[model samples]
Structure formats: structure tokens, C-alpha cells
Target: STGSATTTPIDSLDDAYITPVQIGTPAQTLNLDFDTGSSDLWVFSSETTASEVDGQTIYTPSKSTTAKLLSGATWSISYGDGSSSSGDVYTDTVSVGGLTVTGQAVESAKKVSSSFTEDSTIDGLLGLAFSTLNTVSPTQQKTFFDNAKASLDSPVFTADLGYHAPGTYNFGFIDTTAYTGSITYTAVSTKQGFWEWTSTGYAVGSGTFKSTSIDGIADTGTTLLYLPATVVSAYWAQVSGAKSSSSVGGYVFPCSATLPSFTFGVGSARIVIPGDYIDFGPISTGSSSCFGGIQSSAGIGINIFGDVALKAAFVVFNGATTPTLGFASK
Candidate 1:
């Protein structure tokens, strides 16, 4: 396509981002969490138990003449936060930002956990990860990116996430106007079905850069930034009134505490996450004690550059044979 496509994500309760996508012949529109952590375009639909869905819109494949059931096919997915959804499969026309993916496999939920049932704002999830991570069984499914890649002027998409604000996602091309400064490129090491890479170093403020190799995943769906326990503790130590409150969880500091900027290195490239961005609002009912956004990646098995870190930079998810992750100061 000569001109690229872009969509502004719904604020998504200020935790995640949801983009609009139309599915099937008659075009049933649903808001989807565009996640790079997993690969499956699944939805809350008529097949789901009535009690499992709340205010979110549901897709009714029966209303679309183009929808076709995939015999003996099913899909189940569990998220890092322990949320889960499982269901049957249907192939239909899916469109986003004027781009279309014909015969895209759309998983319709038949069962959902309390987490999903409680999330009334998100109707579904459209995964942006590699197809290798898809959960569809009997036959693995291709993601929308996989199906539409060939038609794009360039097989790439860019994410410009904002802190507690609406942001835009551009498909098929990078919009130069979206970012400032030069784009720093880092090669992706996808050994485990993730956009995995090792950070060159870690730091807080100037001259505090510590060259410790930290492997992490670029996950947009996750809410917070997760690094090694020791690294998280090291940053907390900088704040005089910081406390690790078990009741509130993670590191919490006095709302008046002067926050320091944090940065992570990729080879020689570096991205600075502003100090103001780290104070992820208050832990208590009142705004006196603020919860830290960067937490320990202890149980997750790997560090995650989630929304907290990602919102601070403009990122390009390049899907070339040798995929690359590009970062720019926004």
C-alpha cells in the first residue's frame, strides 16, 4: 500500500490499550488488546457463557455469512497475569486500519476465567507476536500480521505508547512524524517465541550505567516493567522514603519523593525512562504513597519491558527474516 494505516487505541482503563477491529462480512466491531506477548486473535462471543461476559461487545459469527467453523479446532490461552480464555475457532474476514486479512482464524470463547469476565472494556485480544506462539490446536493459526505482511509496503508496524494516555499504532510503515531523534536498532533474539533481546546495561541517571546483561521480552500487553530483583531493589534504594510494602505490593515511596530517571542499554544504544514515569500513581486510597512501576521479574522467568518502559519510547516491530527492534525517543 502507498499510504500506511494507523489507529488510536482506547485508553483501556489506563492499564492496557485496545484498538478497534472489524470481523466477518457484516463487520461486527470489537475492541481488542493488541498484544505482542502472544499470538491468537480470539474474542468473547455468543458461544461464551452469559455469566462470563459483562459489558464487552461479543461477536456473533452466525450473523456473518462469510464466517466458517473450523472442524475439530479449538484454542486456549493463559496470560502472564493468570487470566485465561478458551474456545472454538472460526475463519472470517478481519480488518484493522483499512487493512484486511481474509480467512483469519478468530477464536471465539466458550469458557473464561474471572479475570476476563471482570474486564468489561476489552472484547478480545489481537496478538501481534509471531505465529509460533499461537494456541490454536489440530493446526496452528497465523496472526493478522502474518496473513497481511506480503501486501504491506514494508512488513513492519510501529507503536507509540503514551503514559496513561491514548496512543497510535501504525501498520505496514513507520511514520517519521511520530518520533524524534534517530531510531536505534537492536537485533531480536527470538529463542522462546518472544521478541527477546539482552540489554547491554542498566542505569539510573547519568554515570550510573552498570554493564550487566539482562535478557528481556518486549511485551505491550503487560502493565508494568519487570527487571531482576536486585536491579529493582537497587533503584528503590535511591529513594530515601521508599518501602517495599507487602500490603500494597512492590516498592512504594512517599508521593513527595524526588524521582530519578532510569535507563536500559541495548548494545551501545540506550533508552531513558523518565523519573516521572516511574511513579505509577498512588498505592493507597489517597495519593500519599506512590507505587513503583518497575518491579522484580522473579516468578515470570524473564524480564519484561512492559507498558511502563515501552510508553517512554517509540518502537518498531520489524518482522524481517532477521527481525530487529528499533527504539526512538518520543
Candidate 2:
């Protein structure tokens, strides 16, 4: 698919699931999650007690020469996984590479869980993705693109997932040199910030199968791909006697044979998901079988193409110029 957008891979310092950026005058560093599901940048502060955070990194501003807290206002956020964090607001000068964005709003968690407080790995998350999911209200919010847009040479931010590793997700100026030719752009729907679509069907192995297109969404924040129950069952049907097992929470088939290919239509583009992605690790059923990517989502009525599907293509989020997203190959 081609239109007018570009994306680049971001470097991941370590496999910590968070990217660190230099913030403050003396260059105080902070860890941030490069989430495509949300558009906010927040961090844990020294004032944050040990109880409110868990398994994530926390930042100590006292060590920085430049750091100030936002008076009166406080912030709290909860993830879909039932994890939550609460803290006060603060302002600081943030820098990525040599680029600087001054007076950026950040959070100072007063209390956190073991996922954030207990882990001494990274500092916090810098959300580069576009989404309305945040504990801090819009009135008190400031996104990285909101502050760095004017300074950026181009009004665009590209995500380079394959540049680093399996979980590597980067943000910032689009690196056209990384790609083979011009990038393709897809106009984003104004209804919501998520990249949503519908699945057509599966094309297993060399067999050609028709797709049953449906409405759905794609999110980088989520690690797994979710599909509607009906679509899940239809795709599994092509696997020949594929059965749904309660032990695995969905469906599983014998991995003894080569699985079929699963393809999805995103607008006019056809995204082909190889059978290897369907062959998940064998453990639950005590039998090695081909695992289906289309899993049951209860009644969420939404399908998400997570990192598993995203890492295969180059993605560009055009928040710099307008509300648009571009996809292509590196």
C-alpha cells in the first residue's frame, strides 16, 4: 500500500521494554515506553513511595540539576492488565539525542506497585504512540510531539521496529535512507486514534483461501493479536479438524503438518501472516500443535494487530504534519 508516509526503527538500549531518553539540564535520563496506543510522556519521581509501583523503572529528579514539580495537580494511570500507578505532576527539560524540548510535563508518582517501584532497571515511559488512553486529563496533558513538532526538521515521526531487535520500537525524524523507496501513507480515521480494520480470512500454506473482511484495529501497545470469535472460528476451520480446547483458552491444532497462511486486508493492502506465527509454543494441551494467531476475545468486538504483525512492516505516524499513519517496508 502506498500514499504518503514514512517510518524508521528506534534503537532499544536494552531489552527492558522501555527506551531511555536524556532529560533535564545535566542530562538526567528516563525510561519511556514507545506505545502506539497512547500519546503521552510521563515518569516516576523521587517523591514516589515504594508501595505504588511495580516491575518498572522509577526516576529520581533530585540527582538532576534541573527539575520542578507541578503544584496542586496529580496524575494516576491504569493499564489493561490491571496495573496502576499514581503520582504528582512535574515539569522538566527533556532531550533526545541532541534535540531538546523544554518544560515538558511529567509525572512524579507518590506511590507505585512492584512492577514499577521494585524494578531498578529503567526510569519511566515516553509514549510516542497516538491514543486517548491516559490518567492525566487533556487539560493537564502535554505530549512529546506537541512540544517537539516545531523544532523537528520534518513534521513527521517514524517508528523503526526491526532496526533493533524483536521488541525494539523507535520514534523521531523519519530516516528515508533506511527504506528502499518512497513510503506509503494511509489517512487515519478521526473517530479514534487507534489503527483499526477488519479481517478477511486465512490462506494456509500454499492453499489459497478467501478472506472474510471485518472491522478491527491495530495497536503497538498490545503484544498479542486479538480477533472476534466468529472470525477466529472461521480461520481455524481451514486447519482441518482444528478443535477449540478450554485448557488453552482458545483453539489449537496438531503442529505435525505445515499450517496454512493467514492473510488480512487493511484497506486496499493485503497483509499476509505466515503460518509460523500460528504455531505457538506447545504446553497447555500436552500436545505440540499449530497455534492460531486469531484468539478469542470474549465479547470485546475488537481485533488488534500487535507487535507480532507490526514488526513485519514499516510504520510511520504523521502527527507532525497532520493526523495520518503510513506503512511500508524498510
Candidate of highest TM-score: 1
List the candidate 2 regions with Cα displacement exceeding 4 Å.
1-16, 51-56, 113-123, 130-133, 163-172, 180-182, 195-213, 238-248, 251-259, 278-293
RMSD of 2: 5.2
Local distance difference test scores for all models: 0.86, 0.59
Tens digit of per-residue lDDT, candidate 2, span 158-185: 5544423533333356666655545556
On lDDT, the leading prediction is 1
- Give the TM-scores of the predictions, in the order they appear: 0.94, 0.76
Q: 1-330, model 1: which lDDT tens digit per residue?
A: 422333344543347888889999899999888898999999999999999989989999999999999989999999998889999999999988788888999999999899888888889999988899999999999999888888888888888887767787777888898888888888898778888878888897664799999999999898888999999988888888997888876788998888888898867878899888787777756879988888989888999999888888899999888898998887
Instruction: Tell me the lDDT of model 2 at 52.
Output: 51
